[PDB]
């Protein structure tokens, strides 16, 4: 699997090795070398919507990142990101955190 | 707020409430707010 790994705070019984969520997907696991409970969560995802005045009127665009905190938004990662070809400029274009 | 002796305090918005709302509207909000979108864009509670 692919995801981000952090130390799992969930108390994990000695006979227990795997943890599963409501969907029963594995969310926690103990490292084989040393038993270390580690929570697995998916790498950051979010829908992207493009706001445009209209190609006839102009070519400027506005990009909205659906349901993402502005600081946690990945902009420096051009190489490893879906829709990688967009650098979506940077913070230089003023960024507003909307609801 | 006098209207021919008719009292409209319940239905009218209340400045005391931080979100200007009717006292009746305040009640209706509390009962049926079983679920929400959560507005959790930080997702820091997870992990
Ligand atoms: C009539 O409109 C007046 C405003 O011009 C309001 O005055 C009320 O009645 C007397 C004088 O009319 C005031 O001393 C009271 O203080 C007012 N009532 C309240 C609840 O403050 C009133 O809204 C209207 N009704 C009457 C009967 O005057
Ligand atoms: C209109 O209705 C309001 C709200 O029902 C009433 O205000 C009450 O006033 C008394 C006397 O101070 C208080 O003991 C009550 O607690 C008040 N009601 C509430 C719900 O807090 C009153 O009948 C009318 N008030 C006006 C200004 O017209
Ligand atoms: C290999 O893992 C086992 C237990 O999982 C234990 O011998 C030790 O932690 C590891 N061995 C070495 C040499 O690190
Ligand atoms: C994003 O996270 C930071 C720090 O937690 C802060 O700006 C704020 O809590 C979040 N922004 C929101 C909720 O708009």
UniProtKB/Swiss-Prot annotation, chain A:
Positions of the UniProt region annotated as Disordered: 74-93
Name its species: Severe acute respiratory syndrome coronavirus 2
Query: Glycosylated where?
Result: 56, 69
Report which part of the complete sequence is shown: 548 to 646 of 1273
Query: What is the role of the protein in this entry?
Result: Attaches the virion to the cell membrane by interacting with host receptor, initiating the infection. The major receptor is host ACE2. When S2/S2' has been cleaved, binding to the receptor triggers direct fusion at the cell membrane. When S2/S2' has not been cleaved, binding to the receptor results in internalization of the virus by endocytosis using host TFRC and GRM2 and leading to fusion of the virion membrane with the host endosomal membrane. Alternatively, may use NRP1/NRP2 and integrin as entry receptors.
Q: How does it assemble?
A: Binds to host ACE2. RBD also interacts with the N-linked glycan on 'Asn-90' of ACE2. Cleavage of S generates a polybasic C-terminal sequence on S1 that binds to host Neuropilin-1 (NRP1) and Neuropilin-2 (NRP2) receptors. Interacts with host integrin alpha-5/beta-1 (ITGA5:ITGB1) and with ACE2 in complex with integrin alpha-5/beta-1 (ITGA5:ITGB1). May interact via cytoplasmic c-terminus with M protein. May interact (via N-terminus) with host bilirubin and biliverdin, thereby preventing antibody binding to the SARS-CoV-2 spike NTD via an allosteric mechanism.
Q: What is the effect of changing residue 23 to D?
A: In strain: Alpha/B.1.1.7
- The name this protein goes by in its record: Spike protein S1
